[PDB]
Subunit: 266 residues, 6 copies
């Protein structure tokens, strides 16, 4: 597992975006062999999207043969609502890069047969073979996407009933109105994430410090889902300074020395 | 992993038996595609067998195309001894349901070539492909079947030398005579159990409280074998009230809310 | 996992060497079906090599159809330097047994294309299929070979920059001159080791006591790489008395009783 | 140490108020031998004051010969500001009972010589001899009054610079304006509290659950000041249901059985 | 704190008895300056009493000016019942040594005013000044005498309601009849014990292993009362081999080396 | 407890020396009311002595009415040996300041009656009343002076048999000859240290990191003697950067903010 200890969110997004760019450029994707990218939404990846767009505009990367899969979507919310994850993803990324519509995959929160929607999503991933790089964030309690603590590490794409803490912490978008916040969401599973070739988790804010600690220094346990990334063949935590509060000083010093050459320029 | 927090043993058996019934009825087994059920013996599954029998008699389930594999058997004990696991299983379950003899698999504790017996058992499981649901209990120290603490998670069906604590705690059946209790037993391995599609562990009694804690809140470690079910794709702990003594109040409250809809009726 | 608690290094080497011999003799290797043995260097396996040689000379084992893979080699050191791992392995083992040159595999620390060298090594292992028994030691911090703490459990053969603690602790061979000690080494990966059928770790000295504890009593975590052997299908720790300092008395007593029959004669 | 596990805040205040009443009535205070009561402010003791007033009005207790000492006061806030602790204490308690002004002791946050004020307060306590019962609450991080984590257990009455978390969590009274909230406060010390004959801590809300756990099940350590009450000769924790979230089920069950006879009626 | 690691109960009693003898002989007690000895009952001190008697008979010690205080007594049991603690103490010790009746102090479980009895006992100890050496055992959960877990460290002599586990584990004397076992007992308090000049705890049996661990390696906490002996000026644990099961090997090795000179002869 | 987190040893000595100076100047010592200072030897306080001397020479402090007590001395070493603690203390401090011989107290390692020497030392401290400030260091295992782990917190001045690790780590002064290093030493006790009014521990080097952690973040336990300073009324840890390796980042950040105003200038 790699830990990239940075100072600010802007540095974290530049690092993550540069990592994505370097994986895409080394892979050399084509129409028949696309690079498959898993993506999250929310405030945490914002500086990464901003930096990815920048690099695209600077001519350093093309998304023409990049296929994407998003982690989740609200159930029963119209796709064109500005707070849908569809809307977030276009406004913050797809509106500014050269990816074709047929390459973009998002869960249909309005599908008539929800279990069918979830089944097809998993099938579509398998039609390409695998996600090469899945970027995500982590909950304060170590959970992933809308999966709950003690989720099966093999769980799959499925509908979830959001937690009060989550409606609550999202009611702001439903202009600060915790009654309109959709009750349910579609989310990829933990197994869906773990099947990716590489997993890169963005960790921002002292509210994630216990999760960072559970991921990096704690032992493997299903109650802190993020800890099971220790068993993943290729996992990376990219973090800012406030998120490191619960780590030991020597842990932070170890990774700061091991990755020093890699965190220049960004 | 699911935790089903119930109050009494009778509720635990009804829940477990209803789960088994629902898996069988959704699977729709046939002569050429049987439902494969792994089973334990002892006091812990008694209320489950009693409830399964009841449901069978009420016409809610048929075992005509259900194939079963038991976890273990005493070595050198005549099969018709009333304390053999063969005898337990017929008296508490098979005597009352419609399963055919050819569908019942039990280890032959009287086989002339013990290693061969153990090899054939594993081969028979593989001939059907997989166990769809393996029901078991857990030792006070978290062990499974007759496997010992720090058993390999890939261990397989094999002969074991029973522990004093086990002969001791079983001498009662050998009418309370710890000298007749067979010295050895045949048992499936931890790998045998983990290869099942779903694992459901019955947890009864405050003597199992540390094991329950190690399974649900502790981290993964081979000394408490039950903790490695955290890594299993589909594991369920079904427990009574006294078994919950070592859990945190919030852990019990979390699962009691998450599974509330599912523990009605039983 | 097995723990073989012995008293002295000489007993540990006899036990390990007898284990190796028994695996080879039960396997019955041939020209077209060799026994594949993974091997380490350093002070820790010395009494094992001495005992293996002895058994060979006593006519108890032949290495004619044994293929070996060593864990590592210094980069840029001439192979005939007496402190190369090539030189160690010939002087302590291959010079005294009947293994053919074509059966010996060592990393070429002088290869012109290092990444290519590392790729070919993994390919050669796969050409035979698998390592049947990989013998190794463990770092004071639980690491394996030249892999670092928090290495991926799927990492593979690759070049590493040695740690000061390692150059320091090896400068003695570069006649106690920490300036000549090569800066880099080639090492198999953790995945390389875990892919072996059986892993046997030699544990000598109270400086390994925390690692032994993390391997046997602690939980699974990537910071102590050796702890992930708890998840390996067939792992054995062979240890001397001073290495047991951080274990609980009952843990040492448990394994001392479970393996009693097996540690006679040696 | 006693733990009184109750369900609601109203029950906690009735229990605490009944305890206070029973200590006062058994002591039989007089003009020359007053009962000395230490008191806190804030939302936590509100139901206790409400119940104390009730009991007073029902003729069950008199405060005529009760002397009180409050834990703290804001520095530079006019005493008649409605949010001063003076104002809180009169409005919620002294306005409704028969205690004489000369018996009421509060820190003068407007004293010209602050260190002198703090010295005199300690001297006044010692002039009576000792506090017989000190009632308080506990911070989310286990701290007491305005003392900080890792305060000396012998610290004494003194001025403190409030924490952002505290100004923040109190800005609501300074009509939700975190700029007017006084920067400093006077507070009794941890030694001041520990010198009382009996200490009764009110614990309300799941935000206090980690503190409750540190007080009752954790070990003694100065970072969670409340844990050092384990060393106090006569300490009582009175808590509501949500505060018990981090305790083990058996801990809550133990105290619920030990104190059962004592939590009836309230 | 000293830990005296011995092998058998007989060695523990000889060591403890020799310690007692050496304290008495160095103190040189007289009519007006007696040696004050606190004593327990039960199976744990039996080999100590047997060895003390032996030493007395060998002329190595006199109890003529030794005053004793016992830890506890059953309430409502006639003193001459053979299972009273009075009866135990005479039959196992006082019947065989030269101590005068006026020097023997035992709680009167038949006193008409129980609280008065308990008050007088504490007063009698204080009339002599202090207990020079208090010998005791420890409960499986670390408790002392009949004090419960989380007892105040300043608690005093008082009546207690016995626990089921205790009636249960003592019903054997009430010829194995858990209905006659007195419901209540008088016991010295934890403060009573801690006020002694030196405290020597006898630890026998693997059932005490967790308590031994909490006393010696764990941190100070009131839930394991025995752990607070770490704060006592002069505490000694005398233990047999099975009691050491939960200690680390290096802990046992440390004390075995530090006390080596002192455990010869016994 | 205060933690003063500094970067280098030179800053630690300046801080400590300034603290000492400020305590002395605020106390205003006289012939009949001296300031009593407890002192250690070794490499750890060297920069403090150097800075104290400097301040003395700058006219900021006088030792005319300062009385000192040193922690320890070698047994049987001639006082004028350059490696005696007498010799260390004169060469590094007393040779450069204005303290009178009658004010200097050091243990006489050559006393004819060792127990008498140790008794008189304690008596001399009590003749002045108390040590106002005791400065010391801490062992890698948290021990104090020559006291061992699990020493009584009330232990007193006494002779000790040095540990191999200590002779070993000091043989360098006995020009790197571990055979001349005295076998025994006189040392103040833990009680002697804890009786001081204020205790200031100098913590230098990553080898002290576990001890620092046990002092500041761990719980109270006698195996890490330094942890019991959490119970001391007025304790200060002054540390350099490498010593902070085992602390959590937030712990170091907390104290760095709380003491910021106090670590300027030095």
């Amino acid at each position: 597992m790699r830990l990239i200890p940075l100072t600010t969110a802007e540095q974290v997004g530049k690092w993550a975006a540069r990592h994505i760019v370097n994986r895409i450029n080394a892979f050399k994707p084509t129409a028949d062999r696309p690079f498959v990218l898993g993506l999250p939404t929310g405030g945490t990846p914002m500086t990464t999207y901003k930096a990815l767009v920048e690099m695209h505009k600077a001519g350093q990367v093309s998304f023409k043969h990049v296929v994407t899969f998003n982690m989740d979507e609200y159930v029963g919310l119209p796709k064109e609502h500005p707070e849908s994850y569809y809307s977030f993803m276009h406004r913050n990324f797809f509106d500014h890069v050269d990816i074709p519509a047929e390459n973009i995959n998002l869960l249909n929160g309005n599908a008539p047969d929800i279990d069918a929607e979830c089944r097809q999503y998993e099938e579509k991933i398998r039609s390409y073979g695998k996600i090469h790089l899945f970027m995500g964030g982590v909950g304060n309690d170590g959970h992933i996407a809308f999966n709950e603590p003690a989720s099966s590490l093999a769980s799959r794409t499925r509908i979830k009933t959001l937690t009060h803490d989550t409606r609550v912490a999202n009611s702001r978008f439903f202009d600060n109105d915790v009654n309109q916040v959709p009750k349910y969401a579609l989310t990829v599973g933990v197994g869906t994430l773990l099947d990716a070739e590489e997993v890169m988790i963005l960790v921002l804010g002292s509210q994630k410090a216990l999760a960072l600690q559970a991921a990096v220094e704690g032992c493997v346990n299903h109650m802190w889902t993020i800890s099971c990334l220790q068993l993943h063949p290729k996992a990376i935590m990219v973090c800012d300074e406030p998120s490191t509060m619960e780590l030991k000083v020597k842990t932070l010093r170890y990774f700061n020395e091991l990755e020093a050459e890699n965190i220049k320029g960004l």
